[PDB]
């Protein structure tokens, strides 16, 4: 099984990339369930730029063909306690995302699940032994509410609802 992303317009197969990282936002407020929720970043290109793990691919919430960590998944932030500061997530092993060309780009469900687990594990190092939950974007302008990227002189918009819907103890 794979995770498919509704894209618009339809990205050509040669626009398939390797996810080398992503950027998140920790949800504010409090919960009596001892859980920490993370969503796609509600920040700007500024948040993305300060991550400094991108290559030559202009993308929003997922880093395409960027820098990979040499040991383990590394997470960074200007301030872990400030929920207005995004969290930069650099992967150790890239995950293939293949575009069929008919409007969908598919990602391996197993590899992405394992990836989220490595992210959640590292997140537990910073926020303690709590339940890590990934939820879809809180919203925003088309470029940022979707996983958007440039390829071959064209800008595509891919919904990432199915990428961020997991719970990890």
């Amino acid at each position, epitope marked *: 099984d794979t995770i498919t992303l509704p894209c618009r317009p339809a990205p050509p197969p040669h626009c398939s990339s390797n996810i080398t990282g992503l950027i998140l936002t920790r949800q*504010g407020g409090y919960s009596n369930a001892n859980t920490v929720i993370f969503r796609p970043s*509600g920040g700007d290109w500024r948040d993305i730029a300060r991550c400094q793990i991108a290559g030559t691919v202009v993308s929003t919430q997922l880093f395409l063909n960027g820098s990979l960590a040499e040991e383990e998944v590394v997470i960074r932030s200007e301030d872990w306690r400030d929920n207005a500061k995004s969290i930069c997530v650099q992967l150790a092993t890239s995950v293939e995302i293949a575009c069929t060309g008919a409007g969908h780009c598919a990602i391996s469900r197993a590899k992405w699940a394992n990836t989220l687990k490595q992210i959640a594990s590292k997140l537990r190092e910073q926020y303690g032994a709590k339940t890590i939950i990934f939820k879809p974007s809180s919203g925003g302008d088309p470029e940022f509410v979707n996983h958007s990227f440039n390829c071959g002189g064209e800008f595509f918009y891919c919904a990432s609802t199915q990428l961020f819907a997991s719970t990890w103890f």
Partner: antibody
Amino acid sequence: QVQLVQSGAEVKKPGASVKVSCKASGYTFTGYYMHWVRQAPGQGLEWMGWINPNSGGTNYAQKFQGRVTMTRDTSISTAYMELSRLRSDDTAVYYCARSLGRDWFDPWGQGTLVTVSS
Amino acid sequence: SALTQPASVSGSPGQSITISCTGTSSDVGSNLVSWYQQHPGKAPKLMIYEGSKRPSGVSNRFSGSKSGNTASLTISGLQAEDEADYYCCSYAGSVVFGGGTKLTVLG
């Protein structure tokens, strides 16, 4: 001078929705996050969420996740706050505040009174 | 998180008064809270930010300090216009305001 001006007081029925606007002046609207804080009559201040004026991105408190929607109109430098499925305990004065950092809210709007009653 | 403030406090003109704000979470020494002044029927206003820093236009009478798990707002030259509600605010994790301390100036 830096100034935030909010819309007028409103009376509402439970189950309905309300949309408050916050007009910014004296500074570049996109330069700062906009936060929303409400205050029940005779009670304290309660944080609701912030919005990124450049990306439209938001982050609501889990207490209001699914009931609040925060938007903006950069053309008229206005931030909007909409709360749906209102209840009696949503009766409060709603403030908008310029982030200016972490918890360094300045300045605040004059506030908008939303009375929810059957 | 949760911040605890005294419900009210009293002071006579000219004297100094201190309002305390104690956190029940994991308390780090590493400039925690801000302070807000709110007159009745008015919006809150920033008096002290990042523990002790004071923004432009705010009188020197308002000073900020901290000891252990308790942050404190101290007003030196107490005047009648100081009569308002004072809230402490922390951003750690998620923005949380204190219960508020209703200061009364006994004139």
